[PDB]
Design a protein around this ligand. Sequence first.
Ligand SMILES: Cc1cc2nc3c(=O)[nH]c(=O)nc-3n(C[C@H](O)[C@H](O)[C@H](O)COP(=O)(O)O)c2cc1C
Ligand SMILES: [Mg+2]
Ligand SMILES: [Mg+2]
Length: 146
Amino acid sequence: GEFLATTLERIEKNFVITDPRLPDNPIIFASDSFLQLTEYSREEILGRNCRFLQGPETDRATVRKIRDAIDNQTEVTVQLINYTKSGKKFWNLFHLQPMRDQKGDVQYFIGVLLDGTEHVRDAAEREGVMLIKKTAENIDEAAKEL
Ligand SMILES: Cc1cc2nc3c(=O)[nH]c(=O)nc-3n(C[C@H](O)[C@H](O)[C@H](O)COP(=O)(O)O)c2cc1C
Ligand SMILES: [Mg+2]
Ligand SMILES: [Mg+2]
């Protein structure tokens, strides 16, 4: 297949990296785990905005929260239902944050997905947010010199 994984894309988390300096903030890196979760090949999602994950049951109020975080160049953590290539639904405890360069400018966005079978609360929410925020901090490290 085209676009074999880089070293970074074999990290064992579901994540993407987008480039907001390109039109429509497209995916430029996507982990192996993300591509199995979502059942796409890497080549058919590179260069596309992540909105292909959305479908009829995806709450548009929650999508707007992501949109507004991107516009304000800030982080957000939300839960929403997303869809795979084959149409299967999954809950996504999702964390976005910008990655800044050495001048503080936003260079990339990082998105980390914790897939589940239900909306989580309380301890499962806390532990999931702990994991996706630690993961985002790790990808900030991993992506800084790309
Ligand atoms: C790094 C990154 C990852 C994203 N991951 C998801 C995701 O997992 N699920 C989702 O529904 N939208 C995701 N999005 C949000 C969409 O790409 C898009 O920003 C959102 O649909 C709002 O913009 P729109 O109104 O133009 O579609 C992600 C965006 C970025 C920048
Ligand atoms: Mg696109
Ligand atoms: Mg926010």
